[PDB]
């Protein structure tokens, strides 16, 4: 295809995408296909001659869409939101023409330059401590990573390299491997699986810190674990504190664990992949207090700040401890929405979260398990885990809305996450009515 | 922005991208900006109110473009090609609406299903051994990774896990760390830096195998290194053989090193990130002979098969040893070009490579350093390294074309890589005339 035909087909695809988005409430949010559905519907080999664009788009509607989970449907309340905004989409189109690979500054200067400025824009929007900013010859700075999982891995490897060099300087008699089997990393028992993944990749031990009644990491639990592990010969070197846990959106207490990590010379990485976006609002910035103690901080604009994946924003206090023109998406989103537009987006989602919480709190058959702070509500029917497993199965099997659960200690808990860019109060109210009706069916069945 | 405004701005961006592509030969391929140029031209903070789309696109032309290295200009002959095709661009637009995160099948079934089929399509196009295919209940299969660097890391970690379990089964007296400081990985002395990066991440030693006169890894050099390292107590566990080295597009001899790796129980990973795309052509498939001995194989459609980054295709013989709907781009590209369209694209680039080689071979002031096989020509002025460093500096400073060099043993060598989708014989001839003129200037200066 040449540019003249792209002029036609590109505008046709713009209309197709806009049509899909405008009619997305008519789509069943979760598909009815079963594993392996697609292979019988597609030829076994690539075509030798070209297919037509019309044939391909027809296949998207007929055989791709039936297997799509519509993350941007207003009735998608699962996991955490995925960012999709038209400003980011417009930037991605330009990236296909002027993006490259960005491994060096000379690969394309604009790519590296814009990223440095955009991370300063975002760092100032979050009112981050100035030690994290690229700006005004600060020793710190930010980079865009592909994912929070990658950012956590990068922080662990930087911490691993630093502690090996430190221990070898103190005792030149030590090899890297002898240090390796004594290193231990820490995280909450509510930490995302990416922490364990990073520990396995890095080849170090990982231990979970028991959380308190609010599922937060506290000084007393951390000090108890350090006392045990240091006596056993382990060397704490890395810590992932989480602001906005994937299970219940709880917050580790940075004001308590930060000073401890600094004292112990433990690299403190703050994983705020979801919750970090809300810290651009002054009423939520207090949830980030204590980040001044962290050695690295990370959150995903590609969850809840409307910058289409991939865009994971990581700041490090000292850059010396440490691609797709992904900063173009950030630039577009920040400029076409403005800081106030992004703040209104965050606040609407949090308002809608409290609206669902209000409905659950009106039904004494249910209970709220964790304090509602951002766009997540953790709730369950009072009683057995099995009645709640039945409720979740009935919900996801009806495929009108989509939820995922979690385990809080031994308790099976349902999650309600505000996700879609276009979700409204009516969608939240309808979802609750659906959940309430199915709960009556499930409660009926348990007593009969 | 809502969908109705995206209808307008999306089609406007289609026209802007098409205009850029159609006029790209009027762009200076490499920019004249210096590091730090962008920050004074952009405000220090994000706007509170939204900016207009017109303001943003004007900024792209006025302040972004001057710092862009135009990888898709016909006069870009540096590194290796970056894939940019309109079929892939059309798929990326749809991915912004129906893509998600694809961590599980249930996250969006179509994403996982299409990837499995597309890797079988591509595996059959490469005539890969059937042990690599997802198809017909084969134990092997392919996945799309974000980069060849990531694919090599994934293979190393899989090899690391397997050898630790094997040695602990043979000797339960061993810890993971005690095994770690004995493991050694291998690669050619022409291997990409990603191999060293993977070894550092994985925490294992890496040693280079000396290449032969054709810069290929051979059985004799590998056996010499194994004899030395096994006697020293090292445990070979992982090997990266390269088809199409980044320095000079040489090819490690798989028919020789494959059987050795199988005997030694060394995981053989084949890195063919650039050259792999040509193996869809029968006249180049012989360069892949011996892949039947490999445990994993990888190449980048996002270099030289027109599938916009990111798309790295990795096959593993046994899947049990082991996101963005990136398979949609593969599906679109394969269908709108056809196998024959992709074959014609590969063959044109190789023809153009031989056309440049023919011109260099007509000038006895120059020499060809390595056999020309695919879209890369390694050449230099006869004589000192310094006269060649001067030639490269004069070339890249004129900014009419863009080249990068490499070192072959102690020899400074210039690379000429066919990159752009729209490069023609006229562009290659003009570049040679430019190189020839600057060589006269530089040769003059050395003798005066």
Numbering used by the authors:
A (entry chain A), B (entry chain A): 1 to 322, 355 to 480
What does the original paper state about this entry?
Aromatic amino acid decarboxylase (AADC) deficiency is a severe inherited recessive neurotransmitter disorder caused by an impairment in dopamine synthesis due to the lack/modification of AADC, the enzyme converting l‐dopa to dopamine. Patients exhibit severe movement disorders and neurodevelopmental delay, with a high risk of premature mortality.
We then transfected the DDC‐KO cells with two AADC catalytic variants, R347Q and L353P, which resulted in loss‐of‐function and an altered profile of dopamine metabolites. By combining several structural approaches (X‐ray crystallography, molecular dynamics, small angle X‐ray scattering, dynamic light scattering, and spectroscopy), we determined that both variants alter the flexibility of the structural element to which they belong, whose integrity is essential for catalysis. This change causes a mispositioning of essential residues at the active site, leading, in turn, to an unproductive external aldimine, identifying the molecular basis for the loss‐of‐function.
